[PDB]
Amino acid sequence: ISNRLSNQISGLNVATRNANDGISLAQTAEGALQQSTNILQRIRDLALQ
Amino acid sequence: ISTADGAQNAIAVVDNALAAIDAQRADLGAVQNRFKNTIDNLTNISENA
C-alpha cells in the first residue's frame, strides 16, 4: 500500500503544479481579453461618436 | 509520451504495470519471511539433533 500510495502522493503534487499552471494560463487569457474588452468598448464609443 | 492521448493512456500502462514490480517485491518479501521462519525452525532441529 505504500508504493501505490506514494505514487498517488507524487501524482497529487504534480497535479498541484498543473492546476496552478492552469490558473496562470487562464490569467493570461483574462488579461488579453481585458485589453480586447477595453478596445471593443472604445469601438462602441466611436460608433456613438 | 509526447502526445496527450498517449499521456493518459501511458498512465494506464504504468498503472497496471508498476504494480507487477510491487507484486514481486511483495512475493519476495514474504519469501524472506519464509526463509527466516525456516531458519528459526532449522536451528531447533539442529539443537535437538
Side-chain angles (χ1 to χ4, degrees), chain A residues 32-44:
Chain A
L33 295 174
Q34 291 179 359
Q35 296 295 321
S36 71
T37 300
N38 291 319
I39 295 166
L40 185 58
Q41 182 175 3
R42 182 66 187 170
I43 297 168
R44 184 176 178 180

Side-chain angles (χ1 to χ4, degrees), chain A residues 13-42:
Chain A
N13 291 317
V14 176
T16 60
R17 183 176 292 171
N18 291 321
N20 291 319
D21 290 331
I23 297 168
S24 295
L25 184 66
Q27 183 65 41
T28 304
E30 180 61 16
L33 295 174
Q34 291 179 359
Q35 296 295 321
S36 71
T37 300
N38 291 319
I39 295 166
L40 185 58
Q41 182 175 3
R42 182 66 187 170

Side-chain angles (χ1 to χ4, degrees), chain B residues 15-40:
Chain B
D15 185 0
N16 192 4
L18 184 290
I21 297 168
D22 292 332
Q24 297 290 319
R25 294 179 65 189
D27 293 332
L28 281 73
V31 175
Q32 293 176 352
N33 290 318
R34 294 179 67 188
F35 291 167
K36 184 177 184 293
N37 291 319
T38 301
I39 296 168
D40 289 330

Side-chain angles (χ1 to χ4, degrees), chain B residues 2 4-5 10 21 24 32 39 43 45 47-48:
Chain B
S2 65
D5 290 331
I21 297 168
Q24 297 290 319
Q32 293 176 352
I39 296 168
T43 61
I45 298 169
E47 183 177 1
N48 289 317

